[PDB]
Amino acid sequence: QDPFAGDPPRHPGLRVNSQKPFNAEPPAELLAERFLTPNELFFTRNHLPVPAVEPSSYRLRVDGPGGGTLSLSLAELRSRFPKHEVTATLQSAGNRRSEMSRVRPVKGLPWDIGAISTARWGGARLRDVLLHAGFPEELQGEWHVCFEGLDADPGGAPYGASIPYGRALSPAADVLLAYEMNGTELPRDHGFPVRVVVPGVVGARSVKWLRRVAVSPDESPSHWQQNDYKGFSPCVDWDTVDYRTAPAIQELPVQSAVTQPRPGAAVPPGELTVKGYAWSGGGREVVRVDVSLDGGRTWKVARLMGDKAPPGRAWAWALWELTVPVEAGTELEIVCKAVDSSYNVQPDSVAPIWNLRGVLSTAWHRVRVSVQD
Amino acid sequence: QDPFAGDPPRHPGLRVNSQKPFNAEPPAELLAERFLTPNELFFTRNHLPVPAVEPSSYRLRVDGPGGGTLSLSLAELRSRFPKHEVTATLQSAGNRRSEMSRVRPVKGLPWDIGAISTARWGGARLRDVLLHAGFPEELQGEWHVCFEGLDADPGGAPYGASIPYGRALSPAADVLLAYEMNGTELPRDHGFPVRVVVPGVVGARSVKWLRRVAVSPDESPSHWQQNDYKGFSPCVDWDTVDYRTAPAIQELPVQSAVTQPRPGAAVPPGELTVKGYAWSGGGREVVRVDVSLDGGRTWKVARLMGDKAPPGRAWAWALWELTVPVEAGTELEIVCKAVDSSYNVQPDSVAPIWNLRGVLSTAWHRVRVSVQD
Numbered sequence: 001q002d003p004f005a006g007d008p009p010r011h012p013g014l015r016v017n018s019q020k021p022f023n024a025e026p027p028a029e030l031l032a033e034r035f036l037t038p039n040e041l042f043f044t045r046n047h048l049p050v051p052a053v054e055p056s057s058y059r060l061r062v063d064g065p066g067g068g069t070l071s072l073s074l075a076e077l078r079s080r081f082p083k084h085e086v087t088a089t090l091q092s093a094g095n096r097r098s099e100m101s102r103v104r105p106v107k108g109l110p111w112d113i114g115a116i117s118t119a120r121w122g123g124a125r126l127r128d129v130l131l132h133a134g135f136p137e138e139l140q141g142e143w144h145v146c147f148e149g150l151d152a153d154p155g156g157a158p159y160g161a162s163i164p165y166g167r168a169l170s171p172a173a174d175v176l177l178a179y180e181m182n183g184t185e186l187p188r189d190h191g192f193p194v195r196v197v198v199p200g201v202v203g204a205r206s207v208k209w210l211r212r213v214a215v216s217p218d219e220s221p222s223h224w225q226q227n228d229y230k231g232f233s234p235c236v237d238w239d240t241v242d243y244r245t246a247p248a249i250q251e252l253p254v255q256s257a258v259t260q261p262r263p264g265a266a267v268p269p270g271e272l273t274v275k276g277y278a279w280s281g282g283g284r285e286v287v288r289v290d291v292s293l294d295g296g297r298t299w300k301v302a303r304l305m306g307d308k309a310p311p312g313r314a315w316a317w318a319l320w321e322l323t324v325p326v327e328a329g330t331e332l333e334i335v336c337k338a339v340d341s342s343y344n345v346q347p348d349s350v351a352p353i354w355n356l357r358g359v360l361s362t363a364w365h366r367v368r369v370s371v372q373d
Numbered sequence: 374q375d376p377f378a379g380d381p382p383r384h385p386g387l388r389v390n391s392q393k394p395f396n397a398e399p400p401a402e403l404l405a406e407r408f409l410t411p412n413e414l415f416f417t418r419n420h421l422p423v424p425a426v427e428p429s430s431y432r433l434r435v436d437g438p439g440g441g442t443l444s445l446s447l448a449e450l451r452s453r454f455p456k457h458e459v460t461a462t463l464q465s466a467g468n469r470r471s472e473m474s475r476v477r478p479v480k481g482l483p484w485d486i487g488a489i490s491t492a493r494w495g496g497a498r499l500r501d502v503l504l505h506a507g508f509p510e511e512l513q514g515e516w517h518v519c520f521e522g523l524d525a526d527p528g529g530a531p532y533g534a535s536i537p538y539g540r541a542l543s544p545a546a547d548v549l550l551a552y553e554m555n556g557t558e559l560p561r562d563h564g565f566p567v568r569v570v571v572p573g574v575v576g577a578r579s580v581k582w583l584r585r586v587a588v589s590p591d592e593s594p595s596h597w598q599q600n601d602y603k604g605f606s607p608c609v610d611w612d613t614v615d616y617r618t619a620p621a622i623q624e625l626p627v628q629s630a631v632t633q634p635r636p637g638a639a640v641p642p643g644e645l646t647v648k649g650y651a652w653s654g655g656g657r658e659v660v661r662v663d664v665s666l667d668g669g670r671t672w673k674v675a676r677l678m679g680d681k682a683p684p685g686r687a688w689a690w691a692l693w694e695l696t697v698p699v700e701a702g703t704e705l706e707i708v709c710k711a712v713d714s715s716y717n718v719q720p721d722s723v724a725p726i727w728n729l730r731g732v733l734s735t736a737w738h739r740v741r742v743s744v745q746d
């Protein structure tokens with residue numbers, strides 16, 4: 001019967017948008033409590049039943065340059081390659097989808113602002129694993145590294161995704177084959193025993209339950225690389241959608257949201273502490289977060305907290321707070337917007353960035369609250 | 374007397390915002406006529422009098438790793454290093470400044486939409502020149518490559534700027550010491566005999582009339598790297614400005630403007646061809662340009678023309694056109710917005726991105742025209 005009966009159990013407090021397959025986000029109240037999202041609260045995005053993997057008999061398959069196959073046990077992956085730790089934010093393409101649906105309904109999981117989490121990942125460098133397999137530093141022309149998961153649909157197609165070969169081999173890009181998450185082994189929901197982590201790139205490419213790495217002249221031929229996770233114009237309908245026309249999403253644009261306080265809340269007069277997160281793709285650092293209480297007319301600069309990465313390697317979000325005076329018996333529209341190190345900014349409104357898939361939702365986050373007497 | 378008497382003569386048709394020092398842009402009607410901006414129309418940004426350089430006695434000074442100096446004539450730079458051609462768009466930080474001034478006056482040259490041009494640059498790779506000087510591929514920690522121009526103020530401080538060491542040494546980043554522009558020698562206004570060209574980065578760093586390259590633990594100590602060309606919050610005043618707080622601008626965000634038709638124009642009924650440019654920093658390709666005639670309510674996808682670069686090396690703008698039906702006796706608000714390969718977008722309005730320096734002006738360009746009876 002149930003194809004999902006072997007799924008792991010989860011922490012009780014989550015905002016679950018789908019039980020089967022399991023897709024949940026942490027309550028926004030907890031999301032920015034901590035710089036590293038605890039493993040139990042880390043948002044979970046599963047397309048399929050969670051694989052049950054016996055650790056000893058697991059083998060990761062890596063296709064070598066000549067068409068032969070290298071085969072790696074969990075123990076080999078731990079012992080043969082220097083462990084590297086990378087703190088990276090994973091964000092779903094559809095984070096903040098629900099705000100986009102308010103304009104015009106979209107297809108997809110109705111994510112609120114918490115389809116984003118941060119962990120310290122430990123594992124083998126993908127670069128080292130490929131050099132070990134025999135691949136050079138540089139292949140000429142345009143190449144991609146395909147990943148397949150152990151999870152498959154009833155008809156047998158695995159979850160798959162790819163990244164450009166150059167990113168796979170770059171020391172600076174920090175692409176990991178991770179077996180470790182916030183210092184413990186990878187939880188089942190997060191890809192036990194091995195997942196790719198692609199810093200600075202949409203979560204879709206961080207393939208969980210990794211069963212194969214292949215180098216190819218093209219992208220992953222899988223449905224989710226070729227006919228999904230792509231952004232379109234505000235005009236594109238379902239009968240006119242053309243996935244050949246847009247690039248697969250890799251790097252994500254600058255993003256931010258307010259996590260404290262929550263919409264509709266009553267706040268005590270005097271002082272309010274507004275908190276949130278901000279993040280940008282491509283290793284671009286968040287350099288500023290502006291916060292408004294008057295719906296986006298005046299702004300003040302927030303305080304930023306982060307782990308100060310080297311230029312071009314800002315893989316982790318910035319958490320932000322602003323403590324500001326609030327008067328008895330007023331309504332506030334709390335708004336936040338972030339600015340990255342290439343000075344990309346977030347757009348004012350959602351309607352002009354609307355799309356049928358509900359991805360890439362990065363317009364200013366607005367939270368309407370009231371102050372008591 | 375005149376410190377500017379030796380300045381070169383210019384093409385008569387330019388939009389000159391300053392004669393002394395000379396700062397001009399091409400008429401918007403010509404700007405997107407051609408993919409490569411002709412040398413005579415290429416926008417010109419001079420802080421200072423244009424140096425008069427005798428080609429034979431010119432020497433470029435490169436400080437080696439140990440504190441000695443390498444000295445290179447124009448002939449050596451041409452003969453010792455394989456010439457590399459790079460097609461790159463230079464854009465001023467203050468492009469479209471005048472739209473920002475409409476909200477609240479700013480300090481700076483009142484650029485309209487044409488402080489941007491594209492040329493094929495030929496010259497020595499900066500990377501090769503540094504390897505020749507003895508520098509390694511990688512220095513540990515945070516390093517910068519400083520550039521000084523031959524132009525100096527009356528008190529002797531030269532124009533200077535820097536870029537990160539990693540960009541200087543990257544094969545993929547295409548940083549050139551150029552002596553060639555659209556197939557002819559560099560014109561005086563554009564840096565004869567040698568300029569840096571830093572693809573994907575604000576024009577400020579493409580130091581003209583190059584007289585020195587130095588490698589240093591810090592950025593260029595010059596006024597224009599440390600106390601200018603930095604973006605601030607919509608709230609920052611002149612008495613509260615703090616240049617220690619923001620990153621020097623390097624990569625620029627996604628940008629676009631409508632060049633045809635021009636504001637206020639009358640257009641014949643039936644069909645109108647709207648044209649423009651779009652571009653993004655950091656080698657990020659423009660993947661889509663949306664165009665509106667109704668002030669930003671509905672949109673249609675424009676046709677893109679470009680030189681199809683490898684991923685991450687889209688140094689040149691995209692020109693765009695959309696041919697669309699126009700009805701007798703209506704007013705149109707023509708609006709354009711572009712989307713890059715990291716899916717960064719342009720914000721709706723200018724007020725929320727306002728700053729006292731008038732830089733980073735990338736809100737949607739809006740052109741109001743009428744159609745005749």
Ligand SMILES: Nc1nc2c(c(=O)[nH]1)N[C@H]1C(S)=C(S)[C@@H](COP(=O)(O)O)O[C@H]1N2
Binds near residue numbers: 151
């Ligand atoms: N094998 C496999 N890997 C996968 C997925 C999946 O369904 N199967 N989901 C992808 C998507 S869409 C996202 S957003 C991230 C979510 O990872 P998390 O569950 O650790 O947050 O995993 C990616 N990797």
Ligand SMILES: Nc1nc2c(c(=O)[nH]1)N[C@H]1C(S)=C(S)[C@@H](COP(=O)(O)O)O[C@H]1N2
Binds near residue numbers: 419579
């Ligand atoms: N030596 C020198 N280099 C310089 C400048 C200058 O004043 N002196 N202006 C800088 C700025 S601000 C810009 S935008 C570009 C403009 O180059 P162009 O004149 O070729 O367009 O040159 C840069 N390089």
Ligand SMILES: O=S([O-])[O-]
Binds near residue numbers: 092
């Ligand atoms: O998260 S999915 O629905 O794009």
Ligand SMILES: O=S([O-])[O-]
Binds near residue numbers: 467481482
């Ligand atoms: O162009 S200047 O005035 O920033």
Ligand code: MOM
Binds near residue numbers: 091092094115203
């Ligand atoms: O759907 Mo995955 O990018 O959340």
Ligand code: MOM
Binds near residue numbers: 464466467488576577
């Ligand atoms: O001022 Mo230079 O970036 O135009």
